Amino acid sequence: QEDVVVTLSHQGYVKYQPLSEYEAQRRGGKGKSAARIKEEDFIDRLLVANTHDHILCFSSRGRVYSMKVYQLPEATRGARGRPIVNLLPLEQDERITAILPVTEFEEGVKVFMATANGTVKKTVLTEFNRLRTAGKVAIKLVDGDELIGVDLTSGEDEVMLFSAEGKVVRFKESSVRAMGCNTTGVRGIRLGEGDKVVSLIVPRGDGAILTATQNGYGKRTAVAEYPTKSRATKGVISIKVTERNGLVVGAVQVDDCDQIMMITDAGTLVRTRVSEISIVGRNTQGVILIRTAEDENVVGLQRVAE
Amino acid sequence: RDESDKDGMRIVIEVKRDAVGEVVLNNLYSQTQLQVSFGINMVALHHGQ
DNA sequence: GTACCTACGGCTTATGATTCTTCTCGCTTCCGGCGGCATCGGGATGCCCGCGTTGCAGGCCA
DNA sequence: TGGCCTGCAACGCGGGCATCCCGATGCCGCCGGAAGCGAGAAGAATCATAAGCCGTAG
């Protein structure tokens, strides 16, 4: 069993180490001398599971990879680990989208996916029983499409799709019927000309939804205000888009005690506590979070898993 | 090849270049008669039966 | 001087059949974008006042 | 042994209020693009059938 934690870095280094060693190394505060390095590396994804469980590596090209936990490099024989591109048969410009730990192949657990062209899809976990490290096709992507969000949905859970034009849709997964692995899928969100899906959030708990724009402007909004409409219908107001804001970068559910990660096109990394952001409604623009020049913009928003 | 003599049986097999040989050895163990089962069955007469 | 046949019983291996995985034809119809116009809520810009940010120095903590 | 956290006084500017302009938005008419369900086709696999050897017997 040996409960371990798997930490994927931003540069693509995958590794795992036991929970006792991880909690022992976590004791204490991070040195401020390392925070002055603008070209450092931080943890991108964190998960805790059993060494005998299976993981599903989802790529942007619609392919899914299945492999065991003990096949990854351990904490010994190397501290930083090994690149994920050297252990998984990934093609050129094929980045990992999401990784979902799976303990038991339950029939009631579904693997919900979402593409950039608004096409969403869910697949029964039973069909993912026997898959080797070579992987297979998980979704059929049209020319110009890519996989951007994968999450496990079951029971009466809901899904949310975010756009760059300020639209957002929220509908239950009961209005969708599962299909085969080699099919296209269903449609979930209205997308305008040139607009695409930027993020996905499944409502779990009472965490607030934190969004941001290109010019470093964001806000927070509770989930109790977001209406529950039908699938592929018109989206409710998520954020007031303005030439001062730009396209929506992304949105991630965050609590009142976690952090957020904001990166720009130059490479500036800014860590900002969520307590410094005012809480406003839906049909609002937000407040000033970070400075922005006339030639740069925020290109990525992510919640710190630390 | 073969190198058996009066000092012990010796069989020599040349491994193809650029081959691990362990996968080939496992394939042999799975296919070659070097791995065979055995039908244990203890039946005899106790009082002629 | 030498060769070729089967019965007594069990596991396997050398090849034609059936359920599970997969490859992808058909278009058409309810449905999903797509554009234009009136509408409305936000906010940027300006002024006032007190609170959020920061420097200094001390006691506490990894 | 060195650095993070915090009390305190002085410097600083942003939050709060008022308001007209702007861009998202709902609605309505109009155009288009996956879809998905059923159906047809392809590959993968486990059950069923004919001896071969073991050593005596004819």
Curated annotation (Swiss-Prot), chain B:
Origin: domain of life: Bacteria
Assembly behavior: Heterotetramer, composed of two GyrA and two GyrB chains. In the heterotetramer, GyrA contains the active site tyrosine that forms a transient covalent intermediate with the DNA, while GyrB binds cofactors and catalyzes ATP hydrolysis. Can form a 2:2 complex with toxin CcdB in which GyrA is inactive; rejuvenation of GyrA(2)CcdB(2) is effected by CcdA.
Similarity remark: Belongs to the type II topoisomerase GyrA/ParC subunit family.
Transmembrane segments: none
Domain remark in the UniProt entry: An N-terminal fragment (residues 1-523) can be reconstituted with GyrB, but the complex no longer has negative supercoiling or ATP-independent DNA relaxation activities, although it is capable of DNA cleavage; ATP-dependent relaxation is inhibited by novobiocin and non-hydrolyzable ATP analogs. The fragment has ATP-dependent DNA relaxation and 30-fold improved decatenation activities, unlike holoenzyme it preferentially binds supercoiled DNA. The C-terminal domain (CTD, approximately residues 535-841) contains 6 tandemly repeated subdomains known as blades, each of which is composed of a 4-stranded antiparallel beta-sheet. The blades form a circular-shaped beta-pinwheel fold arranged in a spiral around a screw axis, to which DNA probably binds, inducing strong positive superhelicity (about 0.8 links/protein).
Subcellular location: Cytoplasm
Whole-protein coverage range: 293 to 341 of 875
Physiological role: A type II topoisomerase that negatively supercoils closed circular double-stranded (ds) DNA in an ATP-dependent manner to maintain chromosomes in an underwound state. This makes better substrates for topoisomerase IV (ParC and ParE) which is the main enzyme that unlinks newly replicated chromosomes in E.coli. Gyrase catalyzes the interconversion of other topological isomers of dsDNA rings, including catenanes. Relaxes negatively supercoiled DNA in an ATP-independent manner. Negative supercoiling favors strand separation, and DNA replication, transcription, recombination and repair, all of which involve strand separation. Type II topoisomerases break and join 2 DNA strands simultaneously in an ATP-dependent manner.
Source species of the chain: Escherichia coli (strain K12)
Additional information: When the enzyme transiently cleaves DNA a phosphotyrosine bond is formed between GyrA and DNA. In the presence of quinolones this intermediate can be trapped and is used as an indicator of drug toxicity. The enzyme-DNA intermediate is also the target of a number of topoisomerase poisons, including toxin CcdB.
Name this protein carries in UniProt: DNA gyrase subunit A
